Write a protein that binds this ligand. Structure first.
Ligand SMILES: CO[C@@H]1O[C@H](CO)[C@@H](O[C@@H]2O[C@@H]3CO[C@](C)(C(=O)O)O[C@H]3[C@H](O)[C@@H]2NC(C)=O)[C@H](O)[C@H]1NC(C)=O
Length: 165
């Protein structure tokens, strides 16, 4: 029964997770940007990076943005999309929430969103969050609307990896 730090070390060695930006620390208590999480999904599921394509109009989303190839890949794969379909805003510096992470992993693992889902999640996410809890990606006491901790994202990513591996 591996600890969270053991799960992080294994995923870091595998090139799926990085230390907290600018540090060599796991910082399991810290949050993660949607940009960083897009890279985790690409590494976790071996997606192809997409260079020279930009599907969003976020300020400073362009060829100089390191995350664009990863964000484009998870967009093409149908794992993530804009928060705003009119302004085409991905919110790449926004922190990934537990219910957002749930949608990406449930979609990636082809798990069915739960019918008659009843939980704390935003309306759009209730089925995704429920499926994620039922598959053991997040604990029953996770707040779906909360920013996911790197600890929660390690636990979810390790569980997803084993469910495919
Ligand atoms: C009115 O508030 C908006 O409500 C939207 C749904 O009706 C909500 O949109 C969701 O955004 C989520 C962001 O995370 C993921 C995992 C993603 O695809 O990246 O899932 C997205 C949902 O599918 C949904 N997006 C849309 C276009 O409907 C916005 O987050 C939310 N915007 C903000 C700024 O919080």
């Amino acid at each position: 029964a591996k600890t969270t730090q053991e799960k992080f070390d294994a995923l870091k060695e595998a090139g799926v997770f990085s230390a907290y930006p600018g540090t060599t620390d796991a910082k399991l208590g810290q949050d993660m940007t949607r940009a960083e999480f897009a890279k985790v999904l690409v590494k976790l599921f071996g997606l192809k990076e997409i260079h020279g394509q930009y599907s969003y109009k976020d300020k400073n989303y362009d060829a100089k943005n390191w995350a664009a190839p990863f964000i484009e890949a998870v967009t093409a794969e149908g794992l993530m999309q804009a928060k705003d379909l009119t302004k085409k805003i991905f919110d790449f510096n926004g922190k990934i929430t537990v219910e957002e992470a749930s949608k990406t992993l449930v979609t990636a693992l082809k798990l069915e969103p739960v019918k008659d889902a009843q939980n704390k999640a935003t309306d759009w996410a209730k089925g995704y969050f429920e499926a994620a809890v039922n598959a053991g990606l997040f604990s029953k006491d996770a707040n779906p609307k909360a920013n996911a901790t790197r600890a929660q994202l390690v636990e979810a990513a390790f569980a997803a990896d084993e469910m495919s591996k």
